[PDB]
């Protein structure tokens, strides 16, 4: 029912997450190996690692109209509240979009399940981090991802034919946690677990 071969992935993708909307980001002078966006939604300062394309995108100073999708992590910088990527532009208008999910699953025994789902997007711009994190956590919850089976792929398919693939046998590559896409152009989501 739960295989220890996948324990790290199942623990990573069942971690709680936090969403910060219509917020402000402060980036200061580089002090270590990378640069951080500081966000202060409550009594804490959160350090959001500027990885991948976020490094060039954000100069030092103040950035308004910022959403962040947060998954707090251990780290080697001695930081209490740290997460990687998931910074996006705050909605410029109402967003309430759902995309169809089709899920196919094959265990080691040959049993082939077929689920469907609907995925609610409430952001005009959304990080792959958020999509990857929320879709995996769901698959674990409802389809036993990282229980009996722990590989395969998620494919996000777009109105224009483009796509974004998450391979299920490892974490999303950290650089990709900074990648962002138009939520309301997500057409459907194809999950294949094998």
Ligand X SMILES: CC(=O)N[C@@H]1[C@@H](O[C@@H]2O[C@@H](C)[C@@H](O)[C@@H](O)[C@@H]2O)[C@H](O[C@@H]2O[C@H](CO)[C@H](O)[C@H](O[C@]3(C(=O)O)C[C@H](O)[C@@H](NC(C)=O)[C@H]([C@H](O)[C@H](O)CO)O3)[C@H]2O)[C@@H](CO)O[C@@H]1O
Q: How far is the CB of 162 from ligand X (least distance, A)?
A: 3
Q: How many residues make contact with ligand X (CB under 6 A)?
A: 10
The nearer residue to ligand PIN, 15 or 89, going by C-beta atoms, is 15
Q: For residue 116, what are the CA distances in angstroms to 61, 104, 123, 161, 192? A: 44, 9, 22, 21, 12
| Closest listed residue to residue 85, CA positions, set 103, 104, 72 | 72
Does 55 sit near ligand X (CB under 6 A)?
no
Among 42, 60, 80, 167, binds ligand PIN (CB under 6 A): 42
Does 73 sit near ligand PIN (CB under 6 A)?
no
Cα end-to-end span (Å), the chain? 15
Q: How far is the CB of 1 from ligand X (least distance, A)?
A: 28
Among 60, 75, 77, 162, binds ligand X (CB under 6 A): 162
Q: Which does 72 bind (CB under 5 to 8 A by kind): ligand PIN, ligand X, Cl ion, none?
A: ligand PIN
d(CA 142, CA 144) in angstroms, rounded, equals 6
b/e 83-111 (16+ beta carbons within 10 angstroms → b): bbbbbbebbeeeeebebebebebeeeeee
Q: How far is the CB of 12 from ligand PIN (least distance, A)?
A: 13
Instruction: Give the binding site for ligand PIN (CB under 6 A).
Output: 16, 18, 42-44, 72
């Amino acid at each position: 029912e739960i295989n220890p071969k996948f324990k790290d992935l199942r623990a990573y993708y069942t971690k709680p997450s936090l969403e910060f909307k219509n917020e402000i980001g402060i980036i200061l002078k580089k002090w270590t190996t990378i640069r951080f966006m500081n966000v202060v939604p409550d009594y804490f300062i959160y350090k959001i690692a500027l990885v991948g394309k976020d490094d060039k995108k954000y100069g030092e100073g103040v950035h308004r109209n910022v959403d962040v999708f947060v998954v707090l992590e251990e780290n080697n910088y001695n930081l209490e509240k740290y997460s990687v990527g998931g910074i996006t532009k705050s909605n410029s208008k109402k967003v309430d979009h759902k995309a169809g999910v089709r899920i196919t699953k094959e265990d080691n025994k040959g049993t082939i399940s077929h689920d469907v789902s609907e995925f609610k997007i409430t952001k005009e711009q959304i990080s792959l981090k958020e999509l990857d994190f929320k879709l995996r956590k769901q698959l674990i919850e409802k389809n036993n991802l990282y229980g009996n089976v722990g590989s395969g792929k998620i494919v996000i398919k777009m109105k224009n034919g483009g796509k974004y693939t998450f391979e299920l046998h490892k974490k999303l590559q950290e650089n990709r946690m900074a990648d962002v896409i138009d939520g309301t152009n997500i057409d459907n989501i194809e999950v294949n677990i094998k």
